[PDB]
Amino acid sequence: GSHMPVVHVIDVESGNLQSLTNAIEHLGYEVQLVKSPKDFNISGTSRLILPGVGNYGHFVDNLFNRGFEKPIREYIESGKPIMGICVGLQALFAGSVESPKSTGLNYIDFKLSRFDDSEKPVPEIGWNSCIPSENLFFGLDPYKRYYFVHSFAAILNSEKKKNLENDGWKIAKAKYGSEEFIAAVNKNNIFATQFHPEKSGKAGLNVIENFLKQQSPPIPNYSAEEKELLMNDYSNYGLTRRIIACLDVRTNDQGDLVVTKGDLGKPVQLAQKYYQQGADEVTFLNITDCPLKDTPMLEVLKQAAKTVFVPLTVGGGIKDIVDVDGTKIPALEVASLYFRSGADKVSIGTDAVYAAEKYYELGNRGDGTSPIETISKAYGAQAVVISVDPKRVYVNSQADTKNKVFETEYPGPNGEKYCWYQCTIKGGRESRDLGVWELTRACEALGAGEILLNCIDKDGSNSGYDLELIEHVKDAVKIPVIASSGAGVPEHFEEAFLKTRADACLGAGMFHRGEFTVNDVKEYLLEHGLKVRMDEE
C-alpha cells in the first residue's frame, strides 16, 4: 500500500495481463489495476502503464468507452511517467488501418498500417531488434532481442521520421523485411513499445525496470566480435530462428495433471524449465464434469505465467462448449478466458478443418461463425494458430484427385511422382477429403495468423521434419509456418532453417526427455551462423 512503489495498470479486462502484472511484481513493485477512471487520481499516480492487445478498435473503443481519454491526457499533462505497450503504443497515434473508424490519442499524427505481405509473412511473430542509434532510451539494446507479435505497425519513411525528430520525438526503429517501423517512442514523459517487454524475457524485464526507475542505461561495451555476432543481419527478414518448446497436459488416474502418461505442478515446472533453458515460446497441448471457470488448464497457465516471461500457447479445448450447467459458451469466450488466464495464442485443430470445408462450400467465403473468424476479429490473427495433422497421399497425376498436388522427389510405391497431404481431425483418428494446401489457405483467409505444421508420420521418429511438406505449405500461405514433429537433434532445426522456408521450429519429446535443451539447439544454430535469442535471468 506504501511499503513498495505502486504502478497503476489500466485494465480494459481483455487479454493476458498476467505476464505484465507478474513482471511488475517480480521487479519489487505493487500493482494497482485501474479498470475504471474512478480507480485512480492524477496526484496519487506516479507510474502509469497502458497495456493493450488485440484488434486496435477492440482495445481503443473499450478504453474510451470506459472514459479513459481525459484521465490519460490529464496524467500526461501532469508530466509524470507513462508507458504504453503494443496497442498501448498504437493508441498514441492518429488511428490504425486495422480499425479504420477508430480514433487514437493522436500524439503522433499518422496511422498504423499493415506490413507488406508480398515479401514476408504477416503478422510479424518473433524476436526482432532495435536499429543502432545515438538516441535510444530506457536501456533499449540493439544487440538484444524483443518479442513482436503484430500485423500492423507505424511504418516509417524519410519524411515521417524527420517530422517526428523535429517534433521532439525520440524513435527506436526496427526493420522487418524491407520495411522500417517504430519499435518504441519517447518524448518527455511518454514511453511506449511496439514489442511486449513482459514477453521478452530478461531483456524485456530490464526495459520495464528502466521505465519504472526512470533511467536510460548505457548499452554494454560489446566487443566488435560480440557486435558482429549479436547484430541483426536481416536474415529471416530480421527475426531470429524461433525455437518452440512443447508439452502435453494430461489427466492421470488420481485426476492430477501430468505431462507423461503414468505419473498440477508437473506441467507448470516443465514450462518453467523450458523457459529457464532458452525456450522462445512454450506450447501446452491440453489433452485433459468440470465447470469452465475451474478448468485446471487455466490454473497451469496462471501458475506458469508467474515466472515464464515468454509467449504461451495453448491448444485443445478451444471451441464452442457446453458448460456443466448447460450454459452455452462460445469459442470466443473460451479463448478470452484462456487469454486472461495467461495464454497469448490459442491453437485450433479440428474446427479448422470444418471451417475450411465450409469455406470452399460457400464459394471461398467465411460466414463469420468459425472460431478462427471470431477469435481473430477480436484479438487479431496473431492470437490464432492452426494445428494441422497432414498425411502424404500418392497419386499418378493431378488427374487422380481434386486436391492440389505437388511433384515429390520421393516417388511412391507404384512409382507415383505426385502427392497431396490429407488432413485429419479428432487427434488424427479421422481423415477428411481436404488437402493441407486447401486447409491452410482457407484458414489464412478466415483470419488465422500462424500454422503449426505437425508431420504425423514423422512424430516420434527423431529423424527430422518432413521438408517437402514444409515447402508445400509455405507455397500455400503467407502466414508464418511452424515446423513440428520429427525433431530429435539440433541438426534437424538447422536443416529446417537452412533447407526450408520454415518460420519456426517446435520441439517436444527431445526437450522433455532431457536429451537436449533449447539452449543446446540454440548454441548449435549460433555456431552455424544463424541468429537466435540468447537471454537469461
86 is catalytic: yes
Q: Note if 167 is an active site residue.
A: no
Looking at the Cβ atoms of 6 and 53, the one nearer to Ni ion is 6
CB 254 within 8 A of CB 215: no
User: Measured from the CB of residue 43, what is the shortest distance to Ni ion in angstroms?
Assistant: 17
Shortest Å, Cβ 4 to Ni ion: 5
CA 533/CA 242 separation, integer angstroms: 8
Catalytic residue among 248, 344, 351, 535: 248
Is residue 291 left, alpha or beta, with left meaning phi > 0 and alpha meaning psi from -120 to 50? beta
| Shortest Cβ 1–Ni ion spacing (Å) | 4
Q: Helices marked H in 362-447 — which ranges?
A: 371-379, 436-445
- How far is Cα 37 from Cα 511, in angstroms, rounded to an integer? 46
Nearest to Ni ion of 2, 118 (CB atom): 2
Please name the residues in contact with 325: beta carbons below 8 A apart, sequence gap of 6 or more: 291
Q: How far apart are CA 316 and CA 347, in angstroms?
A: 7
232 annotated binding-site participant? no
Pairing of the two strands 450-453 and 481-483:
parallel
Q: For the chain, what's the residue count?
A: 537
Shortest Cβ distance from residue 32 to Ni ion (Å)? 10
> Of the two residues 4 and 322, which places its CB atom closer to Ni ion in the complex?
4
Task: Judge whether 84 and 108 are in contact, CB under 8 Å.
Answer: no
Distance, CA of 415 to CA of 257 (rounded, Å): 47
Which neighbouring-strand residues pair with 313?
A: 283, 345
Helices marked H in 173-262 — which ranges?
201-212, 224-230
Is 150 part of the annotated catalytic residue set? Answer: no
In angstroms, the CA 193 to CA 183 distance is 6
Quote the least distance from Cβ 6 to Ni ion, whole Å. Answer: 7
Q: 180 in helix, strand or coil?
A: strand
- Site residues for Ni ion per CB under 5 A: 1-3
Question: Toward Ni ion, which CB reaches closer, 2 or 166?
Answer: 2
The closest of 327, 376, 322 to 352, measured between CA atoms, is: 376
Question: Whole-number minimum distance, CB 278 to Ni ion, in Å?
Answer: 36
Q: E-strand spans in 380-491?
A: 384-388, 390-395, 406-407, 418-425, 430-435, 450-453, 481-483
Among candidate residues 196, 351, 373, 466, the one labeled active-site is 196
User: Which lies closer to Ni ion via its Cβ, residue 16 or residue 21?
Assistant: 21
Q: Which candidate in 180, 389, 438, 444 is catalytic? A: 389
Torsion 407-457-530-132 (CA) sign = positive
Q: Which of 58, 86, 423, 505 is catalytic?
A: 86
Q: Which residue among 180, 198, 281, 351 is the active-site one?
A: 198
C-beta closer to Ni ion: residue 3 or 293:
3
449 three-class SS: coil
Instruction: Provide, for the chain, the percentages of residues in helix, strand and coil under a 3-state DSSP scheme, each rounded to the nearest 5.
Output: 35, 25, 40
- Is 196 known to be catalytic? yes
For residue 198, indicate whether it is catalytic.
Answer: yes
- Do the bridges between strand 328-329 and strand 321-322 make them parallel or antiparallel, or are there none, so unpaired? antiparallel
Grid cell at residue 285: 497441448
Q: Mention every residue, 6+ apart, whose C-beta is less than 8 A from residue 254.
A: none
For residue 406, what are the β-bridge partners?
A: 419
Distance of alpha carbon 349 from alpha carbon 352, whole angstroms: 6
Q: Is 317 annotated as a binding residue?
A: yes
Task: Find the shortest distance in angstroms from Cβ 207 to Ni ion.
Answer: 24
Residue 454 counted as an annotated binding residue: yes
Residue 34 Cβ, how far from Ni ion at the closest point, in Å?
17
Nearer to Ni ion, 30 or 256 (CB): 30
Residue 1 or 262: which CB sits closer to Ni ion? Answer: 1
450-453 and 345-348 strand pairing: unpaired
Residue placing its CB nearer to Ni ion in the complex, 43 or 166: 43
How many of the other CB atoms lie within 10 Å of CB of 160? 17
* Residue number closest to Ni ion, CB atom: 3
What is the C-alpha to C-alpha distance for residues 509 and 251, in angstroms, rounded to an integer? 18
- Interatomic CA distance for residues 46 and 212, integer angstroms: 9
Q: Which residues are identified as catalytic?
A: 86, 196, 198, 248, 389
Residue set of the binding site for substrate = 317, 454
Residue set of the binding site = 86, 317, 454
Residue set of the binding site for L-glutamine = 86
